[model samples]
Target: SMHSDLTFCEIILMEMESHDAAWPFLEPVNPRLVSGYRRIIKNPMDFSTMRHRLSRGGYTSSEEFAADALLVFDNCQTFNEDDSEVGKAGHIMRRFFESRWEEFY
Candidate 1:
């Protein structure tokens, strides 16, 4: 299973690598490695599916992906404490992905 920290970074990297670079990450969740995360939800596209899978108790589909994205945004804010290159780079990279996402979807 992928760690939430790494998953977030991977998502950002995927967006950055694309020309349009818009929209949220959409990698298919692995069932074998993280089978416990599978649960019923109204919206499969929501962040809940991924965030819950990456978290302690697991997430339900009804939770919505936007909720997780907002959490990631909040998590990115923590980088301000270090002011390190990775932190600064992540902040900017996330902004690029988020802004492009707004423009497209």
Candidate 2:
């Protein structure tokens, strides 16, 4: 039973550490893709499923990942706040995991 005390920064750290290459933070990378994972994978279930989606989608870069997960893009924005920008666009992501924390496990 994972608790709901999770924060945005904590998930961001874990995602970068475990999911992607350990290139320097300054490396030219797909910023939006990383943010997508950072936002989605905080749920743990999304983290697990993302690995599968990568294989199924044959993704090599952030763009591929984002493109493959079309549902995420289409559905995620529905949850975002109208006034928020990209960096703060995961309120729906967080709320989904937090509110449905029990089902994820």
Candidate 3:
């Protein structure tokens, strides 16, 4: 069961980790340094965190894995401006992720 979900999750994440605009999502937001990051963004998801959990077999299904993956970009959209640097990157990543689901799922 756990193994079943790993393949697709790994596949998608490999590309996501290498995305040109994936810098901000690669590391967790620093609550102490970043203003309001702890309060405003309740749940923070990042590529490194996702990979660690995935490698440890923390997800049960592709759907569950996907939700967290999508959350990375969703969280971005929530906190950044749509036309701003990181915001546009968020939109780009979201679109890329959606397209992957369309083909991979």
Candidate 4:
């Protein structure tokens, strides 16, 4: 199951929007990718687990949390829903891979 956190989504969305506005050359290949990332970022279970892991790993700081959140995206090659392996959200990430291939690879 996927998790949704309005507050957490709101914050990250705002930051992404600001980045979109501030940097002309920098933009997500697919805007909906933000939503996928949001689900992973704000999942309560994952968030708690990450915090625990970070603490045990001797990482303690707000900065570490920020970096850890981004790590979630780096960890995934694709996002999946309950039923299928590919869907709208997954397509966006595919587009991201295509559009940002050079940068990432």
Provide the lDDT at 45 for model 1: 30
Best by lDDT: 3
RMSD of 3: 1.8
The estimated TM-scores of all candidates read 0.35, 0.26, 0.90, 0.26
**Residue range 12-99, candidate 4, lDDT tens digits:** 4234324322221123324454455544534321234443444354344434544544443443333434244333323443344334
Model 2 alpha-carbon miss at residue 3, Å: 34
Global lDDT of each candidate: 0.44, 0.37, 0.85, 0.37
Per-residue CA lDDT of model 1 for 1-105, tens digit only, reads: 444534443453345545342122333334564333336222233233454454543433323333555444444344234375434644655677578556534
**What's model 1's overall lDDT?**
0.44
Clashing residue pairs for model 2: none
lDDT of 3 by residue, 1-105 (tens): 247647877888889889998877888987665688767888899999888888887887888888998889889989988999889999888888899889975
Please identify model 1 stretches exceeding 4 Å from their true place.
Answer: 1-13, 16-63, 79-82
State the local distance difference test value for candidate 2.
0.37
Q: lDDT for model 3, on a 0 to 1 scale?
A: 0.85
lDDT (C-alpha) at residue 104 in model 4 = 30
Residue 93 lDDT (model 1): 50
Better-scoring candidate (TM-score), 2 or 3 = 3
Output the lDDT of residue 103, model 1: 54
Best to worst by TM-score, what's the order?
A: 3, 1, 4, 2
Candidate 2, residues 1-105: lDDT per residue as tens digits? 122332332343345325322222212224455455444433222333444444454344443433323334333444445555532434444444334333333
**Two-way lDDT contest, 1 vs 4, winner:** 1
